[PDB]
Design a protein around this ligand. Sequence first.
Ligand SMILES: CC(=O)N[C@H]1[C@@H](OP(=O)(O)O)O[C@H](CO)[C@@H](O)[C@@H]1O
Ligand SMILES: OCCc1ccc(O)cc1
Ligand SMILES: OCCc1ccc(O)cc1
Ligand SMILES: OCCc1ccc(O)cc1
Length: 472
Amino acid sequence: GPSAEEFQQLRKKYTDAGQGHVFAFVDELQTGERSQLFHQLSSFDPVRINELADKALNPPASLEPLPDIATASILDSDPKDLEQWYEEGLKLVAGNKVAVVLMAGGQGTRLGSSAPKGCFDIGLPSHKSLFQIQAERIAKLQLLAQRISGKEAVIPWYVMTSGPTRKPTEEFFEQHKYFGLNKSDVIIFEQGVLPCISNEGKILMESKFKVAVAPDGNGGIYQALLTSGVREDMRKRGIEHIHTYCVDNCLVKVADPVFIGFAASKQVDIATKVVRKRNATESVGLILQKNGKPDVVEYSEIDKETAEAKDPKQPDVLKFRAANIVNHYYSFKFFESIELWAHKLPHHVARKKIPCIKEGTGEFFKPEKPNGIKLEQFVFDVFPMTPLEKFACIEVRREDEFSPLKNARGTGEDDPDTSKRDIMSQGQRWIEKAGGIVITVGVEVSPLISYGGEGLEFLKGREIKAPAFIEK
Ligand SMILES: CC(=O)N[C@H]1[C@@H](OP(=O)(O)O)O[C@H](CO)[C@@H](O)[C@@H]1O
Ligand SMILES: OCCc1ccc(O)cc1
Ligand SMILES: OCCc1ccc(O)cc1
Ligand SMILES: OCCc1ccc(O)cc1
């Protein structure tokens, strides 16, 4: 393990930085525990931690709805354009130019599962997990693309996890044989962490030999794409277009060809999907403009007066209603610039009850009130680095595209039951549109049968008894 000299040099750095309390219990640690503490502390720069704590604890507009050059809506689109963008998106898939990054490092504190959120079974007839439904969407788009190329189509799946989720995620994917995808085209990687900070700016000790850390927010994606090797893998594959999304949306149109096609046609660096906000209290970030710059306002920071503000000309409708649904497109060229701006991203403060050592006794205690803060970066904080002309915000239909799993069963909204209803409602609607008659709520349609409502003609004239599950 670490030499005395190495350990003293580390101790000097931390002590000079006013963080020498992290070594309060060194004299009683076992060799292994001492090693852990050494390596963990070596992984942070205590001066940087001080810089972050200082900005957090002693912190240092032109703020209207997005302009019309920057916005589009599926509702207002010419159907011939939607068809063309879909075809162009599928051609890019067939070209092996499309990748997916899945943000699955969330805890799911509101959901109360012990397992990764992606593993959750919302109670469909199939009992498929969120991960498996997403994987099957990828499989299906590959198969559709192969129809046009006559060659293998691969959409690599890069799954970002946290330390709370990485091992069980990999085990789950392995036990399912990667849901019929090739393991060689799925990479599970971890996002980074930052130390939790006390109200007084001091690093919190989880144990006598471990610093309390937390994942660094979904904005941690960008640094993690470099350190993980993922960006290099995309380069080696000739990836040009990336779809990034959150695991909790059970209706997510993974690698949606119309989205990719549209974004690519406009040659944007970034595109993003929104829906109309369902009310002033919905826990969604709101996409709007700031200071000549596309930007977002998170639900945890917005002020009542803006969440409740009304449209100038229509006083019964909310002014800000472009709910961020965490559904983003990037050019690969954008990812090649990460190094120039990853350090420019802000840290957002969240005050938290961080279980730690009673700084004295060494007794582990869950505190009664918030004893410190976690810092997080947010994926959308790149939007202001991007010229308005290299940005697109598209309205899509909530009932087809956005059904988040946030809360435990019995909450009443954004829960397993709303998720299940939304998928099975989608299924029924697709069947009906293809000429099927459903007798009854709803019908689960496997993604391997239909990605987006296509391919259901074989049900024309048929009677389907709901609840049902259409599969192989
Ligand atoms: C940083 C980030 O991506 N935040 C997202 C994300 O919030 P959560 O706090 O992870 O629930 O999901 C919302 C949609 O469910 C979206 O509106 C919001 O902006
Ligand atoms: O618990 C004794 C360790 C300690 C060291 C430095 C400080 O500033 C405070 C506490
Ligand atoms: O980057 C994480 C550094 C780290 C190293 C060793 C540990 O035992 C724990 C954390
Ligand atoms: O004009 C908007 C076209 C459009 C529709 C749906 C998407 O997902 C993306 C773009």
